[PDB]
Design a protein around this ligand. Structure first.
Ligand SMILES: [Zn+2]
Length: 317
């Protein structure tokens, strides 16, 4: 891992676009950047993000991706499986940081790609993109060691600029956690003020934190939303709540991440009327936590086909 800290001119061409190949290689050696350079990437990236909508509007094809949790080296593998971002359209559903030892690298790298491919590649906000979880888990400490608090802070402000939702090919709602009792139409997502720390309660907290019932699709009652005793906040939503939201908004499915799958992913119960899974969980961090031993996966919607690409862990020396 080289004591050299990349300079701005090494990392950005004179036109101000980043040389990601050089960036990726240096970071994969556990390189660091000049703090100067890191801040520029974050703030320039955030300026782009802040001008995006609460709810992004993406056309297919796209490869949609789940949780990373600072597994930088599995992210490099993910791009190999998913296709280069130069010719591939990407949507990430949050949780870029914490748990993994390379959270700052994931952010610097992804934000560099956003600056470079502002209209190909997209980022959603995950529940870890806040002060409260990053203060509790690794990420704030990591920034303090490898760079500074200032970088950490720049990241927090940049994370507040992250859109919450994405409407994909006018068929899918893509969100990190899921639904809210307080979000009934797509317009409701439009009207949220996203530029802030996620509140403890609310429609914004819900999108980021909600989970499907543990027995989703086979529930006892018609029970719709019930406090999420697993997260200790927000809600568990049921198959009938989802089916209702889908029909009312003329949508096909909700794609989300957050709950971590062995498979890499998880179809849920087919919407009664469409014949299509009502909900799909995508988790993109292989051998999560060095103990789950799970596959990761990304979703490739393209040309009206829907592939899923699973992948394993990638190593280091
Ligand atoms: Zn999450």
């Amino acid at each position: 891992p080289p004591s050299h800290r990349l300079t701005a001119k090494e990392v950005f061409d004179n036109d101000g676009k980043p040389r990601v190949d050089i960036l990726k290689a240096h970071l994969m050696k556990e390189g660091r950047l000049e703090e100067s350079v890191a801040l520029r990437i974050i703030t320039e990236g955030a300026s782009i993000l802040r001008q995006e909508k609460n709810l992004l509007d993406i056309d297919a094809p796209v490869t949609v991706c789940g949780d990373i949790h600072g597994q930088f080296f599995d992210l490099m593998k993910l791009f190999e499986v998913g296709g280069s971002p130069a010719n591939t359209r990407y949507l990430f559903l949050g949780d870029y940081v914490d748990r993994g030892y390379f959270s700052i690298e994931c952010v610097l790298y992804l934000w560099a790609l956003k600056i470079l491919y502002p209209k190909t590649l997209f980022l959603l906000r995950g529940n870890h993109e806040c002060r409260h979880l990053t203060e509790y888990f690794t990420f704030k400490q990591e920034c303090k060691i490898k760079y500074s608090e200032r970088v950490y802070d720049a990241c927090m402000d940049a994370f507040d600029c992250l859109p919450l939702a994405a409407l994909m090919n006018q068929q899918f709602l893509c969100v990190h956690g899921g639904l809210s009792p307080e979000i009934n139409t797509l317009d409701d997502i439009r009207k949220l003020d996203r530029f802030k720390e996620p509140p403890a309660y609310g429609p914004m907290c819900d999108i980021l934190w909600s989970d499907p019932l543990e027995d989703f699709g086979n529930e006892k009652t018609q029970e719709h939303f019930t406090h999420n005793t697993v997260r200790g906040c927000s809600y568990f939503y049921s198959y009938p709540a989802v089916c209702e939201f889908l029909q009312h908004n003329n949508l096909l499915s909700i794609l989300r991440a957050h709950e971590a799958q062995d498979a890499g992913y998880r179809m849920y119960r087919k919407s009664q009327t469409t014949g299509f899974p009502s909900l799909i969980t995508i988790f993109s961090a292989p051998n999560y936590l060095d103990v789950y031993n799970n596959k990761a996966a990304v979703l490739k919607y393209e040309n009206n086909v829907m592939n899923i690409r699973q992948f394993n862990c990638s190593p280091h020396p």
